[PDB]
Ligand binder design. Structure first.
Ligand code: NA
Lengths: 94, 7
């Protein structure tokens, strides 16, 4: 059971969260057999606080699909975007 | 192990 969430994070100066995972990558601490990109830590007083949560799977960012993406490409895109970034994430619920 | 990258 899960929900899909569309959120806008205003870089100031970064998005304020970390990512793990990726195709051909080293995995993630949330869904071991999923090669997706996962929000891993969120900076507590940063632009993503109260918007994203650890474990959120990023499936789209500024219109780029993050399904089947390499970690390095996800990171470099997210760092290259300017100002407000629109994310679509998937959040699991117990 | 998995690793993380800040953005
Ligand atoms: Na801010």
């Amino acid at each position: 059971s899960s929900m899909e969430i569309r959120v806008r994070v205003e870089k100031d100066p970064e998005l304020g969260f970390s990512i793990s995972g990726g195709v051909g990558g080293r995995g993630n601490p949330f869904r071991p057999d999923d090669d997706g990109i996962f929000v891993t830590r969120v900076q507590p007083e940063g632009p993503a606080s109260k918007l994203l949560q650890p474990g959120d799977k990023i499936i789209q960012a500024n219109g780029y699909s993050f399904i089947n993406i390499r970690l390095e490409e996800a990171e470099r895109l997210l760092k290259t975007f300017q100002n407000t970034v629109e994310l679509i994430i998937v959040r699991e619920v117990s | 192990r998995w690793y993380e990258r800040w953005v």
